[PDB]
Design a protein around this ligand. Structure first.
Ligand code: NDP
Ligand code: NDP
Ligand code: SHR
Ligand code: SHR
Lengths: 449, 449
């Protein structure tokens, strides 16, 4: 029985998924709104078919979904609920590398009634991080140990040698997704109590986070970690934090953008016209003139800087992006998306450059015999150089786990119905085994103290 | 006329030199005290012959030197004068990748009278750094520009992903050489005036040095840079500094070892006996007991720490080295060498790991038209993974330049007699050309401001 999969999306993390599936003899229809993008991804790939499809078209989506055994939603997570509803009425399975949101979880019973499996959070973060966090936690518990502290930090960044731009950041996955993640309020456990961080004040929490001597990482909380007390079954943990890693200087730069209104997704009439960046910025920052001096004067009066050195650096970075120039904007209605169009222009990985994925779990453990130790679980991988034809570390670590999950749902290895995530050794072990043995993907443990 | 070369040494940087020369049809005799070491390096290498030879034996040295056209001194630099005296008697050329010291310079006229060329400072640093520092300086001057500031920083370190040990450092070249360099007094130009740093206080001058967002580099002055005002012909420079790069935390750790006397090369009777580290450390630090508590007590009272966190870190690192344990020391007479034996034991690169060479020149320029700009010349290279059979970045960037120089002295490309260094475009250009076009070795320029 030849299997067939509908892959929604042809972006950053899709090629590895397409490769793994077609290399298994599974037919894959690659679908997104821009036919050309779908063709480019599937060009030369055996068993693949490119088509144009907008998930907003219910009739069109249902007709295509009905032609396959399962749908992979590798598109903006805002669309997952819609995709699941289509899969439910067509009785087809679903796989995503996104968080299970309340909207998605609401469809759990309906999914079960339709007898379908909606497997989520099986990319890098969320995904691989869950697999190895749970692996260690269950091991410790089985040994009568206690997890007093659970930390999990991850960052998809450019390799240090390829990080030379004002932001120390280049895109390896959804550009707008990156900006959206920069506004997420966070919550976590510290010294046994819940600590909250409001979205608009996320960057200010950034602190240097030491992993290895050679890296200059800074970190900030990632979304709400408190539910993991129950999700990972670690009620004894006083500290529980899932965080994000960036390079020195990044958060301060973002903070300024947030403070002057550049991460606002509020529709502005003036942002639908291709006006010069000078003017767009003037309106966004609310400066009295499109002059660089006036714009900067307003920005400095409304932003925070750790020092005059920082201020000089960030302002020069903003200028580098071209927001003070005559170059016309790519009108996208709101500041966030309009800025995003220019970021996509200037922060792309170039020939010969590579990305880097750093993922590290840290466990403060209290052994059964009252003894204490510190354990780390790490994954540090560089992507293949641009122009080599190889995968970036991000695409590999997201797309491969995704493909493995798809194959498991198709062959019944993952058989629970409803809206799921990698939260049971029943499916986590098989996932880890395949990723390790067949692809060399794994987190390595080590006792640090 | 088949050329023959006597390569003294078979350590870290020799394999690339041996490979390049023998691949050129040049016969090479690999010589050092330990016959097995010479054999291991030349095993399977065409045109190579391994022998045991101690440069301290004048008669044996002259006899061997006389059989070749040129001698490469890839051994501790304390031996260069001795090697050159032998080369002078035998009228043979010499090449080293070491600094021209006063002792070596004293032999300049005798070398000239013997008609031989003694080419030095043609490794990575000193070496490649000289080549590209001069290249840019002469370009700017030819354009009527002024070099107001000249900075040159270089570090041979483990790649960030391979830097996971208490020191953030692993050996890629002479272990004791590394330690010796940590005690060198420094001097440089700052704001038009000479600034001196005493050897014992070198580590305290370390400051974060920004190059790329991803790296966490710290830097300190490297030896006396003041002579370069004349050496590089930049009398108009207000700031002139040649420095070294290490990773965050390294200098503070070394500072402690220096303060408690671990970098002393004073012969101690008790350090000639394979006693437990506990005891050795006790005597060296002068603690009232071999107890971990007493030793640490003495250390904390005699060392400096930026914070209690730092103190905890460094003490844990020292314990990691095992100087508080029962393990017997490898008796080497003095603290520096005795400690070195243990460092060599614990700080070696392991399977799959790799080093990193970061070299960057920075020039603050004042153009002819009064305009100003900042230029950087960079080289950032990772070494082949251990076990791959490839060269480390250090071995490649030291050994290849050395081999090219040897070939140039042999065919006459470098013909000036006496004690030399890469200080003239006459020989620097050919050196850079060959290294760039044949091996892809070069520093890339860029205007930063
Ligand atoms: N778990 C993890 O660790 C990670 C998860 N992800 C998740 O993976 C998903 C995809 O990420 P990534 O590949 O980087 O995304 P990209 O932004 O690169 O690509 C998104 C793709 O979705 C398509 N798309 C957008 N809107 C529609 C629509 N209305 N109908 C059909 N297709 C549409 C695009 O279509 P079009 O061609 O028409 O523009 C495009 O091909 C996201 O949900 C992201 O958050 C990403 C990285 C890591
Ligand atoms: N310019 C640059 O950028 C760099 C320059 N260097 C310089 O290169 C030289 C070699 O460095 P590296 O390869 O790392 O050194 P290692 O410490 O790895 O090896 C030194 C070698 O010299 C040999 N040796 C020591 N004493 C004697 C002796 N009495 N007679 C004969 N041989 C002896 C050793 O001999 P044995 O087998 O008997 O023990 C060993 O093979 C040094 O002077 C170093 O400072 C190094 C790195 C970079
Ligand atoms: N947290 C790291 C790793 C990137 C993981 C990206 N995953 C997306 C998932 C969004 C979704 O589809 O639900 C994210 O925003 O965390 C970093 O930011 O560098
Ligand atoms: N300065 C860098 C690069 C190491 C180059 C080592 N060269 C030796 C040369 C000694 C000699 O033979 O004269 C040095 O000590 O700088 C670093 O320290 O990491």
């Amino acid at each position: 029985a030849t299997k067939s999969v509908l892959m929604l999306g042809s972006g950053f993390v899709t090629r590895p998924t397409l490769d793994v599936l077609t290399d298994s003899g599974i037919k894959v229809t690659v679908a997104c709104r821009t036919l050309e993008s779908a063709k480019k991804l599937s060009a030369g790939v055996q068993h693949s078919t490119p088509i144009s499809l907008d998930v907003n078209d219910d009739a069109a989506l249902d007709a295509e979904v009905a032609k396959h055994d399962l749908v992979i939603s590798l598109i903006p997570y805002t669309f997952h609920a819609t995709v699941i509803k289509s899969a439910i009425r067509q009785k087809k399975h679903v796989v995503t590398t996104s968080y299970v949101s309340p909207a998605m979880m609401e469809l759990d019973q309906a999914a079960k009634d339709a007898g379908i499996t909606v497997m989520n959070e099986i990319g890098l973060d969320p995904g691989i991080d869950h697999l190895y966090a749970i692996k260690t936690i269950e091991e410790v518990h089985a040994a009568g140990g206690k997890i007093k502290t659970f930390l999990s930090y991850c960052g998809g960044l450019p390799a240090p040698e390829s990080s030379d731009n004002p932001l120390g950041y280049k895109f390896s996955w959804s550009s707008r997704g990156v900006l959206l993640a920069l506004r997420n309020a966070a919550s976590f456990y510290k010294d046994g109590k819940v600590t909250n961080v409001a979205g608009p004040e996320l960057m200010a929490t950034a602190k240097p986070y030491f992993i290895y001597p050679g890296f200059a990482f800074v970190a900030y909380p990632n979304r709400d970690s408190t539910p993991y007390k129950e999700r990972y079954q670690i009620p004894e943990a006083d500290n529980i934090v899932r965080g994000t890693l960036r390079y020195q200087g990044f958060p301060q730069f973002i903070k300024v953008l947030v403070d002057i209104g550049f991460l606002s997704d509020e529709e502005q009439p003036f942002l639908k016209e291709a006006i010069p960046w000078k003017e767009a910025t003037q309106k966004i920052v609310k400066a009295s003139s499109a002059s660089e001096q006036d714009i900067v004067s307003t920005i400095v009066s409304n932003a925070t800087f750790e020092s005059t050195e920082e201020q000089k650096r960030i302002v020069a970075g903003l200028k580098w992006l071209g927001i003070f120039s005559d170059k016309k904007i790519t009108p996208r209605g709101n500041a966030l998306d309009t800025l995003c169009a220019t970021l996509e222009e200037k922060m792309q990985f170039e020939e010969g450059e590579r990305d880097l994925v750093m993922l590290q779990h840290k466990f403060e453990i209290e052994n059964k015999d009252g003894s204490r130790e510190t354990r780390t679980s790490s994954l540090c991988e560089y992507g293949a150089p641009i122009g080599s034809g190889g995968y970036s570390a991000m695409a590999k670590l997201v797309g491969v786990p995704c493909a493995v999950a798809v194959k498991f749902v198709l062959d019944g290895t993952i058989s629970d119905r409803g809206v799921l995530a990698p939260m049971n050794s029943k499916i986590n072990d098989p996932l880890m085994k395949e990723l390790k043995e067949k692809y060399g993907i794994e987190c390595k443990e080590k006792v640090v103290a």
